[PDB]
Design an enzyme around this catalytic site. Structure first.
Site, PDB file in Angstrom:
ATOM      1  N   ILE B  97       0.795  -1.218   0.000  1.00 23.11           N
ATOM      2  CA  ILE B  97       0.000   0.000   0.000  1.00 23.11           C
ATOM      3  C   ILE B  97       0.842   1.289   0.000  1.00 23.11           C
ATOM      4  O   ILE B  97       1.955   1.327   0.526  1.00 23.11           O
ATOM      5  CB  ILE B  97      -0.970   0.009   1.204  1.00 23.11           C
ATOM      6  CG1 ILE B  97      -1.821   1.281   1.172  1.00 23.11           C
ATOM      7  CG2 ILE B  97      -0.191  -0.089   2.516  1.00 23.11           C
ATOM      8  CD1 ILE B  97      -2.906   1.321   2.225  1.00 23.11           C
ATOM      9  N   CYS B  98       0.300   2.341  -0.607  1.00 21.57           N
ATOM     10  CA  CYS B  98       0.975   3.634  -0.649  1.00 21.57           C
ATOM     11  C   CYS B  98       2.394   3.556  -1.232  1.00 21.57           C
ATOM     12  O   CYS B  98       2.599   3.020  -2.317  1.00 21.57           O
ATOM     13  CB  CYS B  98       1.018   4.203   0.769  1.00 21.57           C
ATOM     14  SG  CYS B  98       1.235   5.976   0.911  1.00 21.57           S
ATOM     15  N   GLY B  99       3.375   4.090  -0.508  1.00 23.37           N
ATOM     16  CA  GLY B  99       4.748   4.058  -0.988  1.00 23.37           C
ATOM     17  C   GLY B  99       5.283   2.674  -1.318  1.00 23.37           C
ATOM     18  O   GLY B  99       6.114   2.517  -2.208  1.00 23.37           O
ATOM     19  N   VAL B 101       3.963   0.303  -2.912  1.00 20.36           N
ATOM     20  CA  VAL B 101       3.718  -0.045  -4.304  1.00 20.36           C
ATOM     21  C   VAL B 101       4.685   0.670  -5.251  1.00 20.36           C
ATOM     22  O   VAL B 101       5.052   0.119  -6.285  1.00 20.36           O
ATOM     23  CB  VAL B 101       2.243   0.227  -4.711  1.00 20.36           C
ATOM     24  CG1 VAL B 101       1.914   1.694  -4.556  1.00 20.36           C
ATOM     25  CG2 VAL B 101       2.007  -0.223  -6.155  1.00 20.36           C
TER      26      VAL B 101
END
Lengths: 193, 193
Positions: B97-99, B101
């Site tokens: 999730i978020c960074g 990825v």
């Protein structure tokens, strides 16, 4: 610079203070620190937090006391009581959620403020729970410098706290909370941004 | 007993993995542990987490790899890459999730799965981002053993992960997520419970 102390005990609820902590700590004018009875406490989720201040070693005065929930609030610890009770005396903004409120109720700290909590029936035999203001059945409640909430209201809890401390304009906090609750795509809908 | 390793780097997003961590760790059959490059990492919110495993010292095999977001994913660390890439090879369920990825995209780990992330334009010049499956504009996406999501979808992220790992019946996970998102009172409405 303003300081927010998050009081966490062992087996604390992971999800309750994450929105408030990030919103505050990212500010240049706000600092977030943790305080507990132990130097290392575990969240219900399995995370181990290295606490900043042990009660009795935390700064005498700060701007916000956030008591997060968990399974360790049935605590007779006199250090803990003094710490919180002193915060009330200094009249500093205080926000309690989930188990934390059970602590407030049992130690007569909810007797002069409107409030809510997880389940009022759990306090029926608390000799110190003699409220002037009745228990409110809502996710979160704010009355002057006290915000209470049940464990399922992290966002409502955060909203009322940011309001209480005049974090930003309402038509700004509203957006932050909308983003938190509904996500980028729904937000982009109602705001474009 | 099954193990879930939460990969957190410095300045990690407090709100992203709290629902998954608590849901899992409370189970008798699941254990949640943290892994990082450092023994102590700070969340964006100001919390300091005492990491369980330093990369290179974590168990060779576990059941779930949860890569949480934050501001430290622009990392060339070869230990980090080997760790994650190995998880992909062993084909263990992975959720980013978020960074996190952004890390997957840059190291060619999103080229064979449908996915989403914070903003695809940030990867436009990634020499290793050559997907067969296009970027999906939704809160979270699941494709086989890979769940991706943007930083504003903790709940969606958690929902798809519990599904992927057959945590419980859908008409059970749905309830857990409803409780998480809407709170006790709205839940009590739609379920009474």
């Amino acid at each position: 610079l303003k300081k927010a102390l998050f009081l966490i005990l062992d087996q604390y609820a992971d999800w309750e203070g994450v929105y408030l902590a990030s919103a505050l700590n990212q500010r240049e004018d706000w600092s977030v620190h943790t305080v507990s009875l132990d130097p290392i406490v575990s969240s219900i989720g399995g995370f181990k937090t290295s606490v900043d201040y042990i009660i009795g070693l935390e700064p005498a005065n700060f701007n916000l006391l956030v008591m997060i929930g968990g399974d360790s609030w049935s605590n007779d610890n006199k250090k803990l009581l003094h710490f919180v009770k002193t915060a009330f005396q200094k009249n500093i903004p205080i926000a309690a959620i989930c188990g934390a409120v059970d602590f407030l109720a049992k130690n007569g700290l909810l007797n002069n403020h409107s409030h809510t909590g997880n389940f009022v029936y759990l306090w029926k035999d608390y000799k110190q729970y003699k409220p002037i203001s009745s228990f409110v059945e809502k996710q979160a409640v704010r009355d002057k410098n006290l915000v209470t909430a049940n464990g399922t209201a992290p966002i409502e809890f955060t909203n009322l706290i940011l309001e209480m401390i005049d974090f930003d304009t309402p038509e700004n906090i509203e957006k932050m909370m909308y983003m938190n609750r509904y996500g980028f795509y729904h937000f982009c809908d109602k705001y474009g941004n």
